[model samples]
Target: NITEEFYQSTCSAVSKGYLSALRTGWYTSVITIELSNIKENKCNGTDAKVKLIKQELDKYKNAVTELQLLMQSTPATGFLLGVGSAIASGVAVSKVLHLEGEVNKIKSALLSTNKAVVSLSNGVSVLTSKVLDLKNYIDKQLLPIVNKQSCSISNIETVIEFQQKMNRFLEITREFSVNAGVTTPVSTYMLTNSELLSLINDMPITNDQKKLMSNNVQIVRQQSYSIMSIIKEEVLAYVVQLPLYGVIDTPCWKLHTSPLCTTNTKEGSNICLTRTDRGWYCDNAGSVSFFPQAETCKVQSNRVFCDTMNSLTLPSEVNLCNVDIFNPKYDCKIMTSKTDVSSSVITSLGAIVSCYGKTKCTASNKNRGIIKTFSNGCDYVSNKGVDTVSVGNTLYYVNKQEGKSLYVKGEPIINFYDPLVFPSDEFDASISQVNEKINQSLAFIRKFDELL
Candidate 1:
C-alpha cells in the first residue's frame, strides 16, 4: 500500500512537469521515467548541459585573450577613476565556471558563480587604481624624464593610442566594407579610447602595501612613459638635424633610425632611416658596379689637382691671411711610384679638416701642424694659379677664399657658421644639465630590456 500510494503521488507530479515541458515545446529535451525515479529524471540532461557550459567557458577564455591583445594594441586614451580591470575581470570570470557539480546551483546564481570572477575583478581594481596613482605621480615626479629628453609625453601617448585606434578602426571598416564588399585599402589610424573607462576601485589594504604596490606600478608606468618619451625625442632630433633634402637626398632618413646601418656609417648621412648598403660596388652612375670588368670602388679616388698649371697647393692659393695648411707626417712605404702620394694627401686632408679656419695649433698637433711644412712628396699649387683641386674624385675649385683656405691651410672649419660661437662654457653647461636626466632614462631602458 505504501509503495502504490507513493508511486501514485510521484506519478502525478511527473505528469504535471512533462505536461509543462510539452506545452513549452521542449519535447526534444523531455524524458519519461518511472514515477518513483523523479529525482533522477529531473537532472537527466545535466551531462549534456555541463558539456555545453564547458564549451561556453572555453569561448570566454579565448575572448579574454583576444580582448587582452585588443586592449594592448589599442592606445589608452580617455581617463576614468579605473574601470577597465573590473570590466576585464568580469568577462574573464564569466568564462571560468559552467555547470560543474561544485557549484551550489539551488542558491542565488549571482553570488556563487561570481566569486572567482569577482576576485579577478578585485585584482584588476587594485591594479587600475595603481595606474591612476602612477599617472598623477608622473605629472608630479616624472615630468623631468620627458622634458629632459626634449619630448612631449602627451604626444607620445597620442602616437601609441593612434596605432591601436587604427587597428580597431580597420576592423570595423573591414567588416562594414566586406559586407558592402569594397576593395580600397583602409587607413590604419582610427583607434580611439573614448568608450574605455579607467578602473577606479581602491582595494582595502594597509598603507605600506599600497605604497609598495604603487611603487611597483610606478616603476612600470614611468618606464613605459619614459621610453615613449625618449623614442619621440630621438626620432624628432634625428629629423630636425637631418641635412636638408636639398643637401642629401630625402631617402637618407633610414640611416639614423636603424642600429645596423648607423653602426657601419662612420659619419651620418643628411637623411634619417636611410642605409648605405656596403660591400656592393658602385660606379659614377650611382649604379652598383658588381661586374668583373668594373673596378670595385664606392668612394672616389681621394686625389686633388691644384691650379691646372701644377698638381700642387700653393701658399698664396687663397686671400685669407690665416689659411691653415697641413703637411704629411709620415712617408709612404708601399708606393709603386714617387707620386703615390696617398699617405701625404690623407695626412694633409685630415689636418686641414681638423683645424680649418683656425690659426693656432694644439699640443696634440705635433709633427702634424698645418702651414708649418709644405714640400713633402705631395701635390699642391706652386704659387701658380690653379682652377680645381680634387678630393678623391670630387672636383672642387679654389674660386672661393674659404674653399681655397681649406686646401692650402690644411685645417678644417667644420661649419663656417662658427661651431665655436656657442662658447665652450655654454655647451659644457648644457651637458651638465642634461646628463643626469639622460642617465636616469638609460637606467629605465635597462630595466625595460630586462623585462623583455
Candidate 2:
C-alpha cells in the first residue's frame, strides 16, 4: 500500500499519472536526478559509484534495445499481436519505447490450436525466467531490506537497477497477455474456439439468438485482459510497498545534521554552519569567528553573511590586505600611467558584446564602447585543454579531443598582456579566483561528453 506519508518522503517515483501508474510507477524521473551530487559526497567513494553506474548501464544494454522491439516494433504478424511502440517518457524502457526490431520466430512456426498453446506456454516460461532473473538481482541488491536505511541513497544503485529491470519486466508481461488475447472466449489458439462457433451455427433458434450467442462469447475472450490487469495490480502492489516508492527529485546528500556553534556577530549569537553532504561554509559574524577552514565571511547589521565562491565575478571594491594591505607594489605605478585595468567582469562584457551583442555602432561608425581584458593573474584562463605548439606559431583550442587538429587557425594572432606591462590593481588577484571557478566549470562540461 502506498501511504501518503511514505510517498511524500521518497525521491523514487514520479507522479502517479506520469505513465501507466498501475505498472511502470512513473519510474523515469529517477534517472535524470543530478548524479553529480552522488559524486560530491559519496559515503564510501566516488570511484565506486561511477564504476557501479557504468557497469549497470552496460549490463542492461541488450534489454534496453529489446524493449524497443516489444513496445515499439513487435510487428503485426498473422500470429502475434503487434504491440507497436509509441512515444513514452517513462523509464529508459518508456523513453526508448516512445521513439521507436528482429522478433521471435516462434509465432511463424506455430500453425494452430494445441501447437499455438505450446508456443504460448513456452513463451510465458521463457519470459518468466527473465523476470525471475531480474527479481534475483533485485533481491541481492536489497540484502537485509528490513534495515531502516536500506532504501536511502546508500543503496540508490539498487533503485536504479530495479527500475531498469522492472520496467522491461512489466512490458514483457503485457506482450504475453496481448498475444494470448488475439480473441477472448474464442481465440485462434484455443482448441474449442471453432467448436463453439460451429455448434452455435447448427443449433441456432432464431437469427437473433445466434447473434446473441456470438456476442456472449466476446466476454470470454477478455480473460487475458483481466489476467493482465491482475498482474499489473499485483506488481504495482509489490512495488509501491518498497522503500523506493515516494516523492521525487533532489539528490540531497546530508548524512548528518548541522549543529549550532558559539558565534561572534550579534545576529542571535548561535548560528549553525551551512553544511551540505560534501562541502560546508559558516558565518563570520565579525564576532569571535569559527572554522578557520571556512573562507572569509562578514557580519554587519546583525546579519551573518557568507562569501561562498559558487561562480566567477568581480567586486567593485576589493580589499588589499593579507591581514595588512594598506598594500602593494603596482598600485602607484598604474595610478600614474594611462593603463587599462581588465577584471573578469569587464573582460566578460567585451566577449559578450563581441560574440553576440550590439556594439558595432555601424552607421559610419558612430560613438562605440570598447570594454577589455588582461592575462596572468589579471583575468582567468587555465590553459588546461588549450595547447601551444613548440613551432611558436600555433595556439590550439583543445576543447574537444576527438577532432584531428586542435589548431583553430594557421598563424596565431592571439595576444595576451604581460602581467607587468605597467601592471595595476589588487582587485585582479581577488577576481582571478572567482573567474577560475566559472572557467573550470565550463571546461568540465565540454570534457564530460566523452565519458558519457
Candidate 3:
C-alpha cells in the first residue's frame, strides 16, 4: 500500500507535470478533446471576456453616432449617456475578469509549489521558472487591454447622456413659436424675446450660468430664428398640400356652390368661423355647415373643396383642380419639405405645423394640444392606411438611427450626436481575432497529431 505522503506527493507532481505539458504540447491535445466534447464552456470563462469586449465596443460606436447626429441638428452638450455607458461596460468587463487578483493568486500558488518540488531533489527549477514566466506573460498581456477598454466604455456613456439633455432644448423653442400665433412664413420668422430667455435658462452651463443664460437668449433668438427660417422655408417649398383656396369663412354647401370656403365644424353641422372683428361665429339655429363647406349656399355640380388636412404634412406630391367657372385647368404640385432644406426655415415651420398643429387654436397653445392630437392621430393613421406626408416621424426615426433619445433630444437636439465608431467589419474582426487566438493555442498543443 502506498503511504499517504507518497500518494500526496505523487498526485501533486502529476498535477504540475500535466499543467506544464499543456503549456508545451500534450496539454493542448487533451484540452481540445475535452473542448470538442463539451460546448464553448471549454474556454473556461475566457470566452466571456472576449465576448464582452465586442459588446462594449458596439455600445461605444452606437453612442458616438448619436452624439454626432445631435451636433448636426443643434449645438448643445450631448452624448453624456453614451460616454457613461461605454465606461460602465469597460469597468464591468474588468471586474468580471478579476485579472489583478487572479494573477497574484497564481503567483503565490506557484511559489508554494516550487518549494514542494524542490524537496524531491530532482532539478526542476527550469520547469518551475518556465511556468512562472508563462503566468507572468499572460498577466502582462491581458491586464492593460482590459483596463483601458473599461475606461473607454465609461467615457462613451457619459457623452451620450449629455447629448440627450442638449437636444431637449430644441423642443422648447418649437413650443413657444407654435403657441404665439406666429403663423405664416414671414410672421414665424424669429423667436420671441421670452422664448429666447426660456431656452437660455434651460441650458446647462458650467460657470456664470445666469450670465450665460441671459446672453444665450439673445444669441439663441437670433441664431435659432436664422436656422429655423432656413429650415421652414425649405419645408414650405414642398408643403404645397394647403387647401385649394385661401382662408374660407366656413364649410357650407351653399358657399361650396359658387366659390366654396372651409370652416371648422364638429358633428351636428354648427360650423366654427371668425368674423373680421369678432371672436367666433356660428351658423343658423338648425342649419349646419358640412365638413369642408361653409353654411351659406351656391354649390355647383362639379365644384368641391378637398380637405388636405388628412395626415401630418411632410414633403410629398400633391394634385389639385382649379376653378375658373367656364374654364378648367388641372395642376399638380410636388413637395420637398425636409427641415434641412438649403436657405429656408419658413417652410420647415409650415411642414412641422401642418403635421403637428393646424388649427388656429393650436398656434395659441404652442402646438402642445396639436402635438398630443397628432400623436394620437399618428397612431390612428398608422392603422388606417392614409399616407399623409409629414416630417415629424421621419425626423424622429432618423434621429434614432443617429442614437438620439426621445425625451432628451426632444426637438432641438435632433441632429447632434457622435458618429458610429465600429463598423460591421470591426465587430467581425473582433470575433475572428479572439477565436483565432483560441484556435492557435489548440493547434500548438496537437502539433504531433497525424491526420485522422
**Best of the candidates, lDDT:** 2
* Residue-level lDDT for 220 in candidate 1: 15
Model 1: residues with Cα > 4 Å off, grouped in runs: 1-45, 52-58, 61-250, 253-410, 414-422, 426-452
TM, every model: 0.14, 0.15, 0.14
* Residue-level lDDT for 178 in candidate 1: 39
lDDT per residue (tens digit) for residues 5-35 in model 1: 0011000000000000000000000000000
C-alpha local distance difference test of each model: 0.20, 0.24, 0.22
Residue 16 CA displacement from its true place in model 3, Å = 96
RMSD of each: 35.8, 30.0, 38.2
For candidate 1, the C-alpha RMSD (Å) to the true structure equals 35.8
Tell me model 2's lDDT, rounded to 2 decimals.
Answer: 0.24
> How many clashing pairs does model 2 include?
10
Give the alpha carbon lDDT tens digit for every residue of 241-340 in model 3: 0011222222221110110112213322211111111011112123321222222111222122222221112111111111111122322111111121
